[PDB]
Design a protein around this ligand. Structure first.
Ligand SMILES: Cc1cc2nc3c(=O)[nH]c(=O)nc-3n(C[C@H](O)[C@H](O)[C@H](O)CO)c2cc1C
Ligand SMILES: CCCCCCCCCO[C@@H]1O[C@H](CO)[C@@H](O)[C@H](O)[C@H]1O
Length: 166
């Protein structure tokens, strides 16, 4: 209820900023791809309060996380760009047919989109970030694909066993 909800968002984003400190590289080769489950707070916020609010959370989350981990602008900007895209799409699908069907149809789609958005993004970033030629990206390609497919897929199914578990 306005003031009651502003605080709810504020502590959930500050909750996600916390969870972002258990980030681990999962892939030993790809030390740049690091998994954190902080996209599960925003996915919950996006379902209750709307797609724009969910992106606001991951936006402020990564800003705070960047203020505390000052030294990864492009990486954090990548996580913010991919993160905002994951929740806003999942929020939008859920948000015209309250039917629980749109909950998973949005997560299946959002997981696929954010995965595709990551490959296209890294295509002109992994060359630029490592100041390398385009072939390095292609060495990393199946790991970038498997990562964001697993990261957002896990976040999709974990948020579902949160709604289930009630
Ligand atoms: C080159 C680079 C590529 C990244 N690619 C992805 C990605 O494909 N999917 C994802 O979820 N996060 C990705 N990240 C997010 C990363 O785990 C997070 O931003 C770390 O905080 C990097 O500092 C990427 C980060 C960098 C630096
Ligand atoms: C609007 C109310 C929503 C409920 C919020 C309670 C906490 C967040 C939901 O799940 C939790 O998230 C953590 C971080 O990702 C996980 O580590 C943890 O295992 C899991 O239990």
């Amino acid at each position: 209820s306005s003031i009651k909800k502003i605080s709810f968002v504020g502590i959930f984003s500050a909750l996600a900023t916390l969870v972002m400190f258990l980030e681990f590289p999962i892939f030993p080769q790809a030390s740049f791809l690091k998994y954190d489950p902080s996209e599960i707070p925003a996915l919950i916020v996006s379902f209750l309060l709307g797609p724009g609010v969910g992106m606001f959370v991951v936006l402020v989350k990564d800003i705070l996380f960047f203020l505390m981990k000052s030294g990864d602008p492009v990486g954090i900007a990548m996580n913010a760009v991919l993160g905002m895209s994951f929740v806003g799409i999942a929020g939008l699908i859920y948000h015209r047919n309250k039917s629980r069907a749109t909950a998973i149809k949005g997560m299946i789609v959002a997981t696929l989109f954010a995965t595709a958005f990551a490959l296209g993004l890294n295509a002109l970033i992994v060359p630029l970030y490592f100041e390398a030629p385009f072939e390095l990206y292609l060495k990393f390609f199946p790991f970038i694909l498997a990562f964001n497919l697993v990261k957002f897929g896990i976040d999709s199914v974990v948020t579902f066993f949160v709604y289930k578990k009630v």
